[PDB]
Amino acid sequence: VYSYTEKKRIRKDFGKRPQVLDVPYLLSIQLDSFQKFIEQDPEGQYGLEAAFRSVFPIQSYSGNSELQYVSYRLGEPVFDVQECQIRGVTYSAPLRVKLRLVIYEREAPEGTVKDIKEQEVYMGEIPLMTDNGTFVINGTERVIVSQLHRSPGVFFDSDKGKTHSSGKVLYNARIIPYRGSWLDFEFDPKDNLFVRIDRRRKLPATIILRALNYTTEQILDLFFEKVIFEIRDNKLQMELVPERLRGETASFDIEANGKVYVEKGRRITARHIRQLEKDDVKLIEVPVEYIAGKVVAKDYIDESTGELICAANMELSLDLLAKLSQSGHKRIETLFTNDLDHGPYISETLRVDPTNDRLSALVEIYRMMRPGEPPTREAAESLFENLFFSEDRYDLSAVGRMKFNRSLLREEIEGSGILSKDDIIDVMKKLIDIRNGKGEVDDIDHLGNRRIRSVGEMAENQFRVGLVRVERAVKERLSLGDLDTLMPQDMINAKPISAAVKEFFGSSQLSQFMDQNNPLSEITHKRRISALGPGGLTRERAGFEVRDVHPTHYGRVCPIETPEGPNIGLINSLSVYAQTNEYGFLETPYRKVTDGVVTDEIHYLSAIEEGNYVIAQANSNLDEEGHFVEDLVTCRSKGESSLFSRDQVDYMDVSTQQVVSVGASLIPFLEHDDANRALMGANMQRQAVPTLRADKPLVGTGMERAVAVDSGVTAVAKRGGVVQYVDASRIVIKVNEDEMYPGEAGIDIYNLTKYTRSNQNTCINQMPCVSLGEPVERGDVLADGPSTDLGELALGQNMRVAFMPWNGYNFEDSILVSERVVQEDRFTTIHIQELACVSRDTKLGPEEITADIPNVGEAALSKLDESGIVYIGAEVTGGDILVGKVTPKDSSLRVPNGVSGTVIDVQVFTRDGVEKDKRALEIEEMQLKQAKKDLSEELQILEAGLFSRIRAVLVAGGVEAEKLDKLPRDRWLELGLTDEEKQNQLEQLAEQYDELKHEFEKKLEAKRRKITQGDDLAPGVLKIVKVYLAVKRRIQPGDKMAGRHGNKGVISKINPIEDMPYDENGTPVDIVLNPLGVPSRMNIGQILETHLGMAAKGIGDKINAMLKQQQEVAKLREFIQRAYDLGADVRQKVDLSTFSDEEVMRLAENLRKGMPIATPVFDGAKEAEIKELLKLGDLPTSGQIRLYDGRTGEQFERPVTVGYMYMLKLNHLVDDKMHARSTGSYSLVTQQPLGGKAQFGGQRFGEMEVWALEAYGAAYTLQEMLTVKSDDVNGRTKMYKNIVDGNHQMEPGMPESFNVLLKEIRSLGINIELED
Amino acid sequence: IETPITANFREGLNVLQYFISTHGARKGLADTALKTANSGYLTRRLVDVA
Amino acid sequence: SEAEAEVAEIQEQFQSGLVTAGERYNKVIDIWAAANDRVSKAMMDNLQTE
Amino acid sequence: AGGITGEYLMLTYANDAKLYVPVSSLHLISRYAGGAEENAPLHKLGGDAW
Amino acid sequence: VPLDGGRFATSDLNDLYRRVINRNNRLKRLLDLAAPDIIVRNEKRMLQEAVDALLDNGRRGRAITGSNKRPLKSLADMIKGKQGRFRQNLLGKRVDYSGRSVITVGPYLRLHQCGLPKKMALELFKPFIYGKLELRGLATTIKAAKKMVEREEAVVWDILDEVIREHPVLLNRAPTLHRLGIQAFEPVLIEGKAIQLHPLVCAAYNADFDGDQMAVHVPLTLEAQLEARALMMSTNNILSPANGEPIIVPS
Amino acid sequence: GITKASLATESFISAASFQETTRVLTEAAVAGKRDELRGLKENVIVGRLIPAGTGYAYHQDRMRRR
RNA sequence: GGAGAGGUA
Ligand SMILES: [Mg+2]
Structure with a gap:
C-alpha cells in the first residue's frame, strides 16, 4: 500500500471519514488559466485565438484589401527562468503570428484576388508563467491575483428606504452587457417606471416599450390581466374570477346565483372564494360604482360614425359607460388593478408618457442620447437599432447571457449576445413582480453573482485592448493607396501590444510582488481572490456587507483566512477543493447521494445551483452502505442550516476540510480554536521564517505533504529509478527500464538551487533527502526546499513548552525562552x-x-x-x-x-x-569554466547513461563480453551482431550520441555567446x-515568534538552562508560555496540540529507549505496530508485517524524535484518544506533570501543563525594528528630519501625540519638539553647540515650515503677514 | 439562527457551527476596524473645538 | 436532549398548523435561550464549588 | 478569401514569405531564364528596405 | 530633485507654472500680432483655465493630469487635507533625538524607570556624550569624539552612565489616545535591543507585548527635563484624568 | 455642533488647520481678519510657548508687558 | 518627491 520512500516516516493519521476525492493540484487556477491563454484553440474561444478571431480579418475602408489571420506560435524564450532572474529581464516568449494580406484588383468586379501574400510577423513578447504560477517580470517573481468582480448580466436590486425620506423602497434593475451601454429601469417614488441609459436623462419605460413596435393595446395586453364586462338587459353582468378577490374589501351587496354570498363591510375571506368556486359562480351583478374608476384596455370606436369614443388606457365614467352602451358595445375590457398585488405601474407611466406612437418615442430617445443635432427619421431608427440590437456594438458574453437567462427562470443558457424584445419584456415583468410583492431582490455578495477573472482572462483582455490600436493602424495603412508593395510587417507594429501587455504584467494593481518567506506563503499568495483592482470596488469605500462572509462562501472561499486591518474580506482566499466553473464562477464538489446511498460520484455544484438542492453536512455518520445513522440530519437547503430527514438529502460534502483554505487547514485542532484566533493563526503561519534546520511538526494535519509538493520549492522526481549520484548541488537519477523513452534514452539530472535570496530577503536552498542508490518513484520528492523536512511542510520547530506564569517574564503575551534554544541554533x-x-x-x-x-x-x-x-x-x-x-x-x-x-x-x-576590469574577467572565466563543465558533465554522465544502455541490450543477440572492451566504448556499433531490431537500436541509441556530438558543438558556443556578451x-x-x-x-529578546493557533508574543528573556523549570527527570522546559492567554483568547486548540505533542514525544522517547540499548527488531516492530493502532476506528491502518526488516530500523530512526501525528481539520483526534496515546507511553494521562522550580529547587504547586507545541518564528525581527537618531539629514522643501529607517530619519511626533503634551502642562517640552528638535534651522545648530558646551537651553525662534506656509498662502492672491 | 451551537470549545465544533462562528467573528473584526476609523475622527473633532 | 425533544414538539405543532411561522421561530429562540441558561447555570454550579 | 474558395500556386520567396498566385492569373508565372535553376537568387518579397 | 537615475522628478507645481507662463506668453504674442477676436478669446479662456488649475486644481469642472491620469497638485492642495502643511508639517513634525523599538516586559523594573538598549541610548545621547568627552579632555575637538564614539571605546559607556543618570526619556505608543500615551521614564541601560516596559503602565498605554513598538524621545533642555520629571513621570500618573480611579491597576 | 462650533471661531488659524481650509481663508480674507494667538493650536502652528501649562506664566508676563 | 501593492500594532 505504501511506497519505498514514504516508509521513511509515516505520519499516524487520525481521522474517521474516508476520503473520496484527494486534494487537487493546489495551483490549478493559475496554471489552468494561463494554459487557456497560451494554447492553440481549434474551436477558437479561449486566449489568443479568441482575440485574433475577434479582431481579424481587418478589411480596408477603401475597399480593396484585407488582412486575415492564419495561426500563431510562441517562440522559444531567449533565456529561461534562472538567468532571467539573474540578469533582471522578463521571462517571455516572442509571439509570431502568420498574417495573410489579400489584395483585391481594381478592374475586376467586387471580390477578386489579384495577389495574396503571407509571412510570419512578430508582434509583442508576452511573459510566460513558470512551472509554478510565478512570472519573472524584471528579475522579480510576481503573481497575478485572481479577481472577484460583478458578472455581466441583469441585476435586480433596491435601496432599502434610504432615499427621498419617504421610508419607501425603490426597486431597480440594471442590464450590464459585457460590451455596450447599460440599461437601467427604476421606480419613481410615485410608483412610476422609468428607463435610462448610461445614467442619462431619465425617461418613462413606455418610451422604450413603444420603440419596439408596441401600441398601447399590446402594452396593456402584456402587462395586465383583463376583466370582462358584459352589458346585458339588467345591470352590468360582469365576469369575475373568484380568486381575484383575495385581499379586497367588500363595499356592496355581493350577490350571485340567487344567493347573497358576501355582504358589504367584509374583507373577502378565503372560504368566500372556496364557496364561490364550489357553487361554480363566474358572472356577477355589480353596481355602477365599481366601474366608476376602472381603466379601459383597448380602443372602442362606434361601429357607424367611426369616431373615437374612449381612448386606450382611459378611466371609465358613468357618462362614458352611457356612450359605449349607446354605440352597441357589449364586451368591455378593463385592467385588473390592486393596491397590493397588481399595481397600475404601467398605466401611470403611460399617463406620464409624452409620446403616443413609435416615431415620437424613437425621437425622444435620440434627443435623450445626443442633445442638439436636430433629429431625422433614420438618425433615430438606426441609432436605436444599433444601440441594443447590433452584434457589432452590443454583446452580452456567454456568462452574460447565462446569467440573463438564469435569473429570468429560463432554460436555454445560450443564445444571441444582443438583447431581444422578449428579454427587455421579461426584465420589466420581473421588476414589476418584485415591486408587487412576489420574489426578492438580488444580493451582490452572492458568489453566484460574482465572477473570477484569473490570470489568463485579464491578460487576454489587456492583449485585446492593445490589439485594438494595432487594428486601427492596420486599417489606416490598408486604406491608404498603393498596396502592391506592402507586406504584413510595414503596417503592424509590436509596440502597442508589448506596451499594453508589459503594463499589465509589470505595474498593475493585481500583478503584485510575491510573498516568498515560506512555501506556504507562495502557495497561498497564488490562490488569493482579491475583490479589488480594476473593474472592482475601492479599499476604503467598501461597506460592511461586502466585507462579511456570506452563506454562499461554504466550499468556495475560506471564511477564516483573510487579512485584518484596512481590508478584511477584500483579499479573501480560495478554499481547498474549490474550482472555477466554465463561466468563471466558483464551484465546489459534492458526492451525489441517491435514494439512500452516499455514492462516490462527484458533481461540482456552482454557487447558484447549490441553493436548489439540499446538501448534507460534512461529518454525518454514514456506515458501510451510504446510509445515514440518524433520521434528523443537519443540512443546508438555501443558506439555512437545519435538520432534515434521511431520504430527503440530494448531496453530501466531499470532505470535512473543504470549508477552509490551504493555509487554515494546516492548523491542528482547528475545531477547538476560535475564529479570530484561527484567522490570526493562518495569517501568522504565512509569515514564518525558514530556519537553519527544518523540523517536522509532531502534530500536523496531513495537508503538509500536499503543500510541500504542490509548491515548487522541493525538487521532485519525474520518472522513477535509482539514485545514481547525490551531491550537495545536484541529484542524478538513472531512470528505470520501462519509463525510459526509446529515443533519447538518457537519465534525469536535477540541479538544486543553493543559497539564493527570496523576495523577503530570506534564504531559499534545496538539500538532498535521498541517499546514494535509493529506489525513488514517480512523483516522489528528492530535495527538500526551504523549511520542509522529508518533503512535508515544516515552517518552524516543535518545542517543549510549559503553560505557567514565570516571574512576570511572560506577563502579557511575552515568551520565556531557554538558553539551550539558542545553544542548539534551532531558530x-x-x-x-x-x-x-x-x-x-x-x-x-x-x-x-x-x-x-x-x-x-x-x-x-x-x-x-x-x-x-x-x-x-x-x-x-x-x-x-x-x-x-x-x-x-x-x-x-x-x-x-x-x-x-x-x-x-x-x-x-x-x-x-x-572594457572590463580583471575582476569581471575573473568571474567571467570562472563562469565560463562551469558552462564547459556543466555541459560536459551533462554529456559525459549521459554518455555513461547511453553506453550502459548500449551494453544493456547486449545481454542477448550478439554477446561477446571480452570483445566489448577490446575497442573502447566509442565504437560499439560495427561489432558482430545480427542486423535486426536490436541492431536498429544500436544505430538509434548512438544516433542520439551523434546528435549529442552535435549538441555539444553548438550549446557550449551559445553559452559563450551569453556569458561574455554585454x-x-x-x-x-x-x-x-x-x-x-x-x-x-540567531534569536534575541524582541523577536516575535508565534504558534499555529494565533498566539503571538515577543520573546522577553533568554533565561539560562539551570533557571528553566525541570521535571522529575531533569529535562528542562524549553519555552514557558502564559496560561492567561487561553481563556480570554479562546484558542483551546493550543492546549490539545500540547497534550498531543507530549504524547507524540512519548512514543519517540520509548523508541529512543529501544534503540539506545540495542534491542531486537521484533521488539521495535511490535511497539511501532501498537503505536499506529489505538485509534477509535481510524482509517490509517498500516501493517508493519509487510516491512522488509530494514525499513523498520529506518522507520524507527526517523521516529526517535517523536512519532508524527496527522490531525485532519475537522476529523481531529478526540480527547479520549489523546489520553489513550498518553497511556501507551508511560506519561501521565492528565497531560500535566509535577514540575520543579529551576532556581529555588523546590516543587511548583498545582501540576502544570507541559508538551511539545510547534512554535514558529515570524518575520518581525527586532534587528530590523530598532532605530535611533540624534541628528542626521533633513528634508529639502521643509527643514524637518527625514522619515524612515533606510533614510536615517527621526520619529514623527504627530498631531495626535501633540495633544498629549498640551493635556499635560509640558509647554517647554512641546516647544522644543516642534522648533528646536525638528524645524527651526537657526536654533537647532545653536542647540548642538549648546548641548556639547554643557548648556541645556534653547533659543527657539520660528519653525521653518511656518515660513513655507506663508510663502504658499502668499503664492495665491492672499496677503498674510505678521503684526507688530 | 434557530439552531444554536451546542458544542463548547473543549469538544469539537463541526463544520456548520464553525461557519456560523465565523459569521459572527468576521462581523466583529470588520466592525472593530471601521469603528477605529470613526472614533479617530470623532476625537479629532472634539479636540479641535475645545 | 430535552431542548431537542421540545423543539421537535414545536415543529410538530407547526406542521399541523396550530402555530404560525414567526411564532414558532420566536418559541424556538426562547426555548434555546432557556436551554443555554440552564447549561450555563449547571456549568457554573459544577465549577465554582467543585 | 472572404467566402470564395479558390486554387492558388504557392511560391516561397526570401525569409519564407509565401505568395499565392491564382491559377487564373497563371500567365505572370514565368519559368527561370538565367540557366542557374539550382543557383538562382531569392528575392525578398515586398521590397522592404529596397 | 533627481531620481538618481539621471532623470528629474515631476514637481507638479513647476508644470502648472510652466503652463501658465506658456499660455501667457502665447497670448502676449497674439496681442502683439493683432489676432482675430475669436482666437485671442479662446487663448484668454485657456489662460484663465491654466491660472485656475494653478491656484486650486480640480475645483473647476475638469482637473489636469500629469502622469498616469493622476491630477496635478496645485497650490491649494499643499494646504488642504492630511498631507497639507497644517496637518502634516505644522501641527505635528518629525523630531530629532528619537528612536523606536519593540517592547518587552522586564518586570524587575520600578514604576519610574524603563529599559533602554545600549546602542539606542548611545545614539540618542550622542551630543551629551560629546560634551562629557570634551569635559574630561579625552578629545580636544568634536571629530575625535565622533570617531571615539563610533569606535565605541571602553570609556564611552561610563560616559553614557553619566549622561543617563537623571535624564528621563519620553516613551510614546503609536496610537496615543489620551495623555497617558506619552510618559516620562528613567532609562536603565540594557545589553539588548528591546525597550523593556514596566508591566503596570501597560494599562495606561494599552500595550500588550505581542509585537508592539514604542518611540523614545529625549527631552533636551533643562525646562524639558524638569517638565518630564514633574508632570510626565510615571510615578505621577497613577490616576486617570477621565475619572479618579487608578490607572496603574495590577493587570 | 463640534464641526461648526470650531469653524465659527474668532481665530482663522484654529479653524483653518481644521477642515475646509479653502472655505475658511476666503471668508477670512475678504473680511480682513486678524488672529491674535489666543489659543493652544495656533501657538503650536507658529512655534512658541503654549498658554496653558508651564508656559502659562510666560503669556501673562507677555500680556502685562503690553 | 509621488503613485500602486502588501504587512505590524
Ligand atoms: Mg499589541
Missing part, C-alpha cells in the same frame, strides 16, 4: 541581502571602481581585491567598503550601518562596449556590480 535563520553599486555616465565622464580612494587606510582596503571589489567570503561588518568608487572632481558602496555578514556572491554586469542596462548606467551578504540572525 537561527539566514537572511541574504543584495547591494548594488552602479556606474553612472555623468559629467566629467564615468567613475572608476578601483581601490584607490582618498582618506582610507589599509585597515579599510584590507578586504577589497586588486580591482576594487570585495573578496568572496570576506566577513564584513557595518561601515566597511564593498565596492570602492570615487567621485569625479568617495562614492564607495558601504555596508548599511548595522548589518554584518559574509559576502557569498558578487555579480558584475557591464554594458555592450565597455548585458542590457538602463540609459545612464555603464556597469553594475552586485554584492550578496548572508547574515545569521
Whole structure:
C-alpha cells in the first residue's frame, strides 16, 4: 500500500471519514488559466485565438484589401527562468503570428484576388508563467491575483428606504452587457417606471416599450390581466374570477346565483372564494360604482360614425359607460388593478408618457442620447437599432447571457449576445413582480453573482485592448493607396501590444510582488481572490456587507483566512477543493447521494445551483452502505442550516476540510480554536521564517505533504529509478527500464538551487533527502526546499513548552525562552541581502571602481581585491567598503550601518562596449569554466547513461563480453551482431550520441555567446556590480515568534538552562508560555496540540529507549505496530508485517524524535484518544506533570501543563525594528528630519501625540519638539553647540515650515503677514 | 439562527457551527476596524473645538 | 436532549398548523435561550464549588 | 478569401514569405531564364528596405 | 530633485507654472500680432483655465493630469487635507533625538524607570556624550569624539552612565489616545535591543507585548527635563484624568 | 455642533488647520481678519510657548508687558 | 518627491 520512500516516516493519521476525492493540484487556477491563454484553440474561444478571431480579418475602408489571420506560435524564450532572474529581464516568449494580406484588383468586379501574400510577423513578447504560477517580470517573481468582480448580466436590486425620506423602497434593475451601454429601469417614488441609459436623462419605460413596435393595446395586453364586462338587459353582468378577490374589501351587496354570498363591510375571506368556486359562480351583478374608476384596455370606436369614443388606457365614467352602451358595445375590457398585488405601474407611466406612437418615442430617445443635432427619421431608427440590437456594438458574453437567462427562470443558457424584445419584456415583468410583492431582490455578495477573472482572462483582455490600436493602424495603412508593395510587417507594429501587455504584467494593481518567506506563503499568495483592482470596488469605500462572509462562501472561499486591518474580506482566499466553473464562477464538489446511498460520484455544484438542492453536512455518520445513522440530519437547503430527514438529502460534502483554505487547514485542532484566533493563526503561519534546520511538526494535519509538493520549492522526481549520484548541488537519477523513452534514452539530472535570496530577503536552498542508490518513484520528492523536512511542510520547530506564569517574564503575551534554544541554533535563520553599486555616465565622464580612494587606510582596503571589489567570503561588518568608487572632481558602496555578514556572491554586469576590469574577467572565466563543465558533465554522465544502455541490450543477440572492451566504448556499433531490431537500436541509441556530438558543438558556443556578451542596462548606467551578504540572525529578546493557533508574543528573556523549570527527570522546559492567554483568547486548540505533542514525544522517547540499548527488531516492530493502532476506528491502518526488516530500523530512526501525528481539520483526534496515546507511553494521562522550580529547587504547586507545541518564528525581527537618531539629514522643501529607517530619519511626533503634551502642562517640552528638535534651522545648530558646551537651553525662534506656509498662502492672491 | 451551537470549545465544533462562528467573528473584526476609523475622527473633532 | 425533544414538539405543532411561522421561530429562540441558561447555570454550579 | 474558395500556386520567396498566385492569373508565372535553376537568387518579397 | 537615475522628478507645481507662463506668453504674442477676436478669446479662456488649475486644481469642472491620469497638485492642495502643511508639517513634525523599538516586559523594573538598549541610548545621547568627552579632555575637538564614539571605546559607556543618570526619556505608543500615551521614564541601560516596559503602565498605554513598538524621545533642555520629571513621570500618573480611579491597576 | 462650533471661531488659524481650509481663508480674507494667538493650536502652528501649562506664566508676563 | 501593492500594532 505504501511506497519505498514514504516508509521513511509515516505520519499516524487520525481521522474517521474516508476520503473520496484527494486534494487537487493546489495551483490549478493559475496554471489552468494561463494554459487557456497560451494554447492553440481549434474551436477558437479561449486566449489568443479568441482575440485574433475577434479582431481579424481587418478589411480596408477603401475597399480593396484585407488582412486575415492564419495561426500563431510562441517562440522559444531567449533565456529561461534562472538567468532571467539573474540578469533582471522578463521571462517571455516572442509571439509570431502568420498574417495573410489579400489584395483585391481594381478592374475586376467586387471580390477578386489579384495577389495574396503571407509571412510570419512578430508582434509583442508576452511573459510566460513558470512551472509554478510565478512570472519573472524584471528579475522579480510576481503573481497575478485572481479577481472577484460583478458578472455581466441583469441585476435586480433596491435601496432599502434610504432615499427621498419617504421610508419607501425603490426597486431597480440594471442590464450590464459585457460590451455596450447599460440599461437601467427604476421606480419613481410615485410608483412610476422609468428607463435610462448610461445614467442619462431619465425617461418613462413606455418610451422604450413603444420603440419596439408596441401600441398601447399590446402594452396593456402584456402587462395586465383583463376583466370582462358584459352589458346585458339588467345591470352590468360582469365576469369575475373568484380568486381575484383575495385581499379586497367588500363595499356592496355581493350577490350571485340567487344567493347573497358576501355582504358589504367584509374583507373577502378565503372560504368566500372556496364557496364561490364550489357553487361554480363566474358572472356577477355589480353596481355602477365599481366601474366608476376602472381603466379601459383597448380602443372602442362606434361601429357607424367611426369616431373615437374612449381612448386606450382611459378611466371609465358613468357618462362614458352611457356612450359605449349607446354605440352597441357589449364586451368591455378593463385592467385588473390592486393596491397590493397588481399595481397600475404601467398605466401611470403611460399617463406620464409624452409620446403616443413609435416615431415620437424613437425621437425622444435620440434627443435623450445626443442633445442638439436636430433629429431625422433614420438618425433615430438606426441609432436605436444599433444601440441594443447590433452584434457589432452590443454583446452580452456567454456568462452574460447565462446569467440573463438564469435569473429570468429560463432554460436555454445560450443564445444571441444582443438583447431581444422578449428579454427587455421579461426584465420589466420581473421588476414589476418584485415591486408587487412576489420574489426578492438580488444580493451582490452572492458568489453566484460574482465572477473570477484569473490570470489568463485579464491578460487576454489587456492583449485585446492593445490589439485594438494595432487594428486601427492596420486599417489606416490598408486604406491608404498603393498596396502592391506592402507586406504584413510595414503596417503592424509590436509596440502597442508589448506596451499594453508589459503594463499589465509589470505595474498593475493585481500583478503584485510575491510573498516568498515560506512555501506556504507562495502557495497561498497564488490562490488569493482579491475583490479589488480594476473593474472592482475601492479599499476604503467598501461597506460592511461586502466585507462579511456570506452563506454562499461554504466550499468556495475560506471564511477564516483573510487579512485584518484596512481590508478584511477584500483579499479573501480560495478554499481547498474549490474550482472555477466554465463561466468563471466558483464551484465546489459534492458526492451525489441517491435514494439512500452516499455514492462516490462527484458533481461540482456552482454557487447558484447549490441553493436548489439540499446538501448534507460534512461529518454525518454514514456506515458501510451510504446510509445515514440518524433520521434528523443537519443540512443546508438555501443558506439555512437545519435538520432534515434521511431520504430527503440530494448531496453530501466531499470532505470535512473543504470549508477552509490551504493555509487554515494546516492548523491542528482547528475545531477547538476560535475564529479570530484561527484567522490570526493562518495569517501568522504565512509569515514564518525558514530556519537553519527544518523540523517536522509532531502534530500536523496531513495537508503538509500536499503543500510541500504542490509548491515548487522541493525538487521532485519525474520518472522513477535509482539514485545514481547525490551531491550537495545536484541529484542524478538513472531512470528505470520501462519509463525510459526509446529515443533519447538518457537519465534525469536535477540541479538544486543553493543559497539564493527570496523576495523577503530570506534564504531559499534545496538539500538532498535521498541517499546514494535509493529506489525513488514517480512523483516522489528528492530535495527538500526551504523549511520542509522529508518533503512535508515544516515552517518552524516543535518545542517543549510549559503553560505557567514565570516571574512576570511572560506577563502579557511575552515568551520565556531557554538558553539551550539558542545553544542548539534551532531558530537561527539566514537572511541574504543584495547591494548594488552602479556606474553612472555623468559629467566629467564615468567613475572608476578601483581601490584607490582618498582618506582610507589599509585597515579599510584590507578586504577589497586588486580591482576594487570585495573578496568572496570576506566577513564584513557595518561601515566597511564593498565596492570602492570615487567621485569625479568617495562614492564607495558601504555596508548599511548595522548589518554584518559574509559576502557569498558578487555579480558584475557591464554594458555592450565597455572594457572590463580583471575582476569581471575573473568571474567571467570562472563562469565560463562551469558552462564547459556543466555541459560536459551533462554529456559525459549521459554518455555513461547511453553506453550502459548500449551494453544493456547486449545481454542477448550478439554477446561477446571480452570483445566489448577490446575497442573502447566509442565504437560499439560495427561489432558482430545480427542486423535486426536490436541492431536498429544500436544505430538509434548512438544516433542520439551523434546528435549529442552535435549538441555539444553548438550549446557550449551559445553559452559563450551569453556569458561574455554585454548585458542590457538602463540609459545612464555603464556597469553594475552586485554584492550578496548572508547574515545569521540567531534569536534575541524582541523577536516575535508565534504558534499555529494565533498566539503571538515577543520573546522577553533568554533565561539560562539551570533557571528553566525541570521535571522529575531533569529535562528542562524549553519555552514557558502564559496560561492567561487561553481563556480570554479562546484558542483551546493550543492546549490539545500540547497534550498531543507530549504524547507524540512519548512514543519517540520509548523508541529512543529501544534503540539506545540495542534491542531486537521484533521488539521495535511490535511497539511501532501498537503505536499506529489505538485509534477509535481510524482509517490509517498500516501493517508493519509487510516491512522488509530494514525499513523498520529506518522507520524507527526517523521516529526517535517523536512519532508524527496527522490531525485532519475537522476529523481531529478526540480527547479520549489523546489520553489513550498518553497511556501507551508511560506519561501521565492528565497531560500535566509535577514540575520543579529551576532556581529555588523546590516543587511548583498545582501540576502544570507541559508538551511539545510547534512554535514558529515570524518575520518581525527586532534587528530590523530598532532605530535611533540624534541628528542626521533633513528634508529639502521643509527643514524637518527625514522619515524612515533606510533614510536615517527621526520619529514623527504627530498631531495626535501633540495633544498629549498640551493635556499635560509640558509647554517647554512641546516647544522644543516642534522648533528646536525638528524645524527651526537657526536654533537647532545653536542647540548642538549648546548641548556639547554643557548648556541645556534653547533659543527657539520660528519653525521653518511656518515660513513655507506663508510663502504658499502668499503664492495665491492672499496677503498674510505678521503684526507688530 | 434557530439552531444554536451546542458544542463548547473543549469538544469539537463541526463544520456548520464553525461557519456560523465565523459569521459572527468576521462581523466583529470588520466592525472593530471601521469603528477605529470613526472614533479617530470623532476625537479629532472634539479636540479641535475645545 | 430535552431542548431537542421540545423543539421537535414545536415543529410538530407547526406542521399541523396550530402555530404560525414567526411564532414558532420566536418559541424556538426562547426555548434555546432557556436551554443555554440552564447549561450555563449547571456549568457554573459544577465549577465554582467543585 | 472572404467566402470564395479558390486554387492558388504557392511560391516561397526570401525569409519564407509565401505568395499565392491564382491559377487564373497563371500567365505572370514565368519559368527561370538565367540557366542557374539550382543557383538562382531569392528575392525578398515586398521590397522592404529596397 | 533627481531620481538618481539621471532623470528629474515631476514637481507638479513647476508644470502648472510652466503652463501658465506658456499660455501667457502665447497670448502676449497674439496681442502683439493683432489676432482675430475669436482666437485671442479662446487663448484668454485657456489662460484663465491654466491660472485656475494653478491656484486650486480640480475645483473647476475638469482637473489636469500629469502622469498616469493622476491630477496635478496645485497650490491649494499643499494646504488642504492630511498631507497639507497644517496637518502634516505644522501641527505635528518629525523630531530629532528619537528612536523606536519593540517592547518587552522586564518586570524587575520600578514604576519610574524603563529599559533602554545600549546602542539606542548611545545614539540618542550622542551630543551629551560629546560634551562629557570634551569635559574630561579625552578629545580636544568634536571629530575625535565622533570617531571615539563610533569606535565605541571602553570609556564611552561610563560616559553614557553619566549622561543617563537623571535624564528621563519620553516613551510614546503609536496610537496615543489620551495623555497617558506619552510618559516620562528613567532609562536603565540594557545589553539588548528591546525597550523593556514596566508591566503596570501597560494599562495606561494599552500595550500588550505581542509585537508592539514604542518611540523614545529625549527631552533636551533643562525646562524639558524638569517638565518630564514633574508632570510626565510615571510615578505621577497613577490616576486617570477621565475619572479618579487608578490607572496603574495590577493587570 | 463640534464641526461648526470650531469653524465659527474668532481665530482663522484654529479653524483653518481644521477642515475646509479653502472655505475658511476666503471668508477670512475678504473680511480682513486678524488672529491674535489666543489659543493652544495656533501657538503650536507658529512655534512658541503654549498658554496653558508651564508656559502659562510666560503669556501673562507677555500680556502685562503690553 | 509621488503613485500602486502588501504587512505590524
Ligand atoms: Mg499589541
